[PDB]
Amino acid sequence: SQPKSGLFVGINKGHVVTKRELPPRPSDRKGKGTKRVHFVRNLIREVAGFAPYEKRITELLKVGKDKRALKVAKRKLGTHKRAKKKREEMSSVLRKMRSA
Template identity: 50%
Template sequence: MESCWFPLDRFPPARTEAGGCDSRPNPNLMVRLAQLGFGRPCSWRQPRPPTPTAPSSRLTRHRQRTTKATMARAQSTRTAPTRTGLPRGLNRGHKTTPRVLPAKPSHGKGRASKRTTFVRSIIREVAGFAPYERRVMELIRNSKDKKARKLTKRRLGTLRRAKRKVDELTGVIAESRRAGH
């Protein structure tokens, strides 16, 4: 007997036209059980097939953290499966039409506007870099990234902020190289 998601030997066999019993399980019963959700995979019976992982759209040095905003964006793009109207199964429940909700204003928290980025760039031009930033840039130029991260973490408080600052200063160095040559 071939491998199946649920134990076939527990179900009554199908009746043949002659009145005898067939050795195979009843296909109508199997279909009905699958509709009711009893045909779901069991971890002890057969392993689930591996889910394919999609490559990340943004590749950075440090791991991307999932925040409330990213989760909300993912949920807004994802559509709920249509319900079957049956009381059992994966998509059980009444057939309904999903409401399309507008994006919350709070989901935009932390995203810099054009005006803010413009003002910050002008301040950067006028004021220049802080002494610790100049030291970090020198460490990056001498390919001492770990030391640069450690110093930045000490100054800024968290490793996440430090990594972001080191990435920003690496970009500044690359930009100055491009402008110089």
């Protein structure tokens, strides 16, 4: 964003150069899900089913005990960063199966 302060030490220290906005590259969309891959994954999801711990997540969420849902999801997957979003995804599956 805006350039350095020009003063060698302190908040936003450094030497002043007129900063520049980088053109969009490939790999800034890296991971942006696409129409067909979403189609594929969603189709295969119910055909395969749900893994047993994911079913336990569904059960704990439909009880509403989100802390233990996250806890067991973390103990299965391994890290909080992915446990959190696995809980989000399974909460999404429960809203999309209590929508109807």
